Design an enzyme around this catalytic site. Structure first.
Site, PDB file in Angstrom:
ATOM      1  N   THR A 160     -10.401  21.584   2.559  1.00  0.00           N
ATOM      2  CA  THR A 160     -10.967  21.470   3.913  1.00  0.00           C
ATOM      3  C   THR A 160     -10.781  22.732   4.747  1.00  0.00           C
ATOM      4  O   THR A 160     -11.264  23.783   4.346  1.00  0.00           O
ATOM      5  CB  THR A 160     -10.472  20.199   4.653  1.00  0.00           C
ATOM      6  OG1 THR A 160      -9.094  20.336   5.020  1.00  0.00           O
ATOM      7  CG2 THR A 160     -10.658  18.964   3.767  1.00  0.00           C
ATOM      8  N   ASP A 261     -16.495  12.246   1.701  1.00  0.00           N
ATOM      9  CA  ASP A 261     -16.173  13.362   2.571  1.00  0.00           C
ATOM     10  C   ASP A 261     -17.288  13.578   3.591  1.00  0.00           C
ATOM     11  O   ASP A 261     -18.472  13.550   3.245  1.00  0.00           O
ATOM     12  CB  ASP A 261     -15.975  14.611   1.716  1.00  0.00           C
ATOM     13  CG  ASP A 261     -15.693  15.841   2.524  1.00  0.00           C
ATOM     14  OD1 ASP A 261     -15.186  15.717   3.657  1.00  0.00           O
ATOM     15  OD2 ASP A 261     -15.992  16.935   2.010  1.00  0.00           O
ATOM     16  N   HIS A 293     -12.001  13.332   1.012  1.00  0.00           N
ATOM     17  CA  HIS A 293     -11.133  14.502   1.233  1.00  0.00           C
ATOM     18  C   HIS A 293      -9.855  14.433   0.465  1.00  0.00           C
ATOM     19  O   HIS A 293      -9.052  13.568   0.797  1.00  0.00           O
ATOM     20  CB  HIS A 293     -10.447  14.321   2.588  1.00  0.00           C
ATOM     21  CG  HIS A 293     -11.168  14.875   3.760  1.00  0.00           C
ATOM     22  ND1 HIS A 293     -10.581  14.918   5.004  1.00  0.00           N
ATOM     23  CD2 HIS A 293     -12.412  15.372   3.900  1.00  0.00           C
ATOM     24  CE1 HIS A 293     -11.439  15.431   5.866  1.00  0.00           C
ATOM     25  NE2 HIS A 293     -12.558  15.715   5.224  1.00  0.00           N
TER      26      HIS A 293
END
Length: 317
Positions: A160, A261, A293
């Site tokens: 991320t 995600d 994620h």
């Protein structure tokens, strides 16, 4: 009394006391992890601005060859998480052992006190620090790098926000008037569900709520002064007039995505842009499955997580 807030991630008071989301507490380095056999140490990369790290060394059962280095940047939307968490420690223990590589988990600076590009700068400091080992210009060398590290196999990555950070590092390295000590090159980039966004909703992104998206709030906190706001090249690498992704300073690049995600479509656009940017390297994409994620850090025992670790192992090579 409260000066800033981005719930559920972070609260900042007048005095600079900060509440953060904490998904796992920090754990200590280990001389030898019981499950994986990986050794770890906590070291200082730079005193000021302060940048530290945990370095991971797998069981040295043979020493004919030196090992790839994986510099890893944790996620947490530039404002939370840690290089030393239970989740990252246990994850990089797994990766280091499965892939047979050296990992470096970077503790870079965070919001609220250090806006971007502080974290970007800290990653670059890290890479310079690594490269100075290779040309013998490191003042306080880490013996593990001198002894076991293959400097021709440097990989950089994360999840991320950390994957966003690695991405910006790749662009810097691929810039002409930018060099690492000894003109060291990055072999590969590994970007796991990288944090990218933009002012206009794309793909499966919700249309009306877009202006209120958590990403908008996160970017405003991380870089309020950013020209173009949420369309600044640092957060939106496909924005018109951004640096060409043909200048990514590595030769192999794996982009990782998942089903649930929120960045899936941004990640997909990013890969596709790299593909048709003219970039010359080995470009790869991996759809990890119906997961969130960073699911593999949280549930490393699932078939899906195991399959992901195996895929990464064959990339970090």
């Amino acid at each position: 009394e409260i000066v800033k807030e981005v719930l559920p991630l972070i609260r900042v008071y007048k005095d600079g006391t900060v509440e953060r989301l904490l998904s796992s507490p920090n754990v200590a380095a280990s001389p030898e992890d019981p499950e994986t056999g990986v050794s770890s140490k906590d070291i200082v990369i730079a005193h000021n601005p302060y940048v530290s790290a945990r370095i991971f060394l797998p069981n040295i059962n043979k020493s004919h060859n030196k090992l790839p280095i994986f510099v890893y940047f944790h996620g947490g939307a530039f404002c939370v998480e840690s290089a030393f968490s239970f989740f990252v420690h246990r994850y990089l223990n797994i990766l280091a052992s499965q892939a047979n590589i050296i990992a470096v988990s970077v503790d870079f600076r965070l919001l609220p006190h250090h806006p971007l590009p502080a974290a970007y700068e800290d990653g670059w400091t890290t890479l310079q620090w690594i490269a100075s080992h290779a040309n013998n210009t490191a003042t306080n060398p880490e013996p593990w790098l001198l002894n076991h590290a293959d400097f021709n196999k440097l990989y950089v990555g994360g999840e991320t926000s950390g994957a966003n950070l690695a991405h910006n590092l790749l662009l810097r390295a691929g810039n002409g008037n930018q060099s690492l000590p000894g003109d060291l090159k990055i072999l590969g980039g590994l970007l796991c569900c990288p944090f990218f966004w933009g002012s206009k909703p794309i793909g499966s992104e919700p249309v009306d709520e877009h202006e209120q998206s958590l990403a908008m709030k996160v970017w405003n906190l991380a870089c309020p002064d950013a020209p173009g706001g949420i369309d600044n090249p640092w957060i939106n690498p496909c924005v018109a007039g951004a640096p060409s992704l043909a200048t990514l300073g590595c030769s192999k690049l794996l982009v990782t995505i998942t089903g649930r995600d929120e960045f899936r479509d941004r990640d997909i656009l990013y890969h596709d842009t790299v593909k048709k940017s003219g970039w010359e390297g080995q470009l790869e994409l991996f759809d990890a499955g119906d997961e969130e994620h960073a699911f593999q850090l949280f549930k490393p025992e699932t078939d899906t997580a195991k399959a992901m670790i195996k895929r990464l192992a064959s990339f970090l090579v």
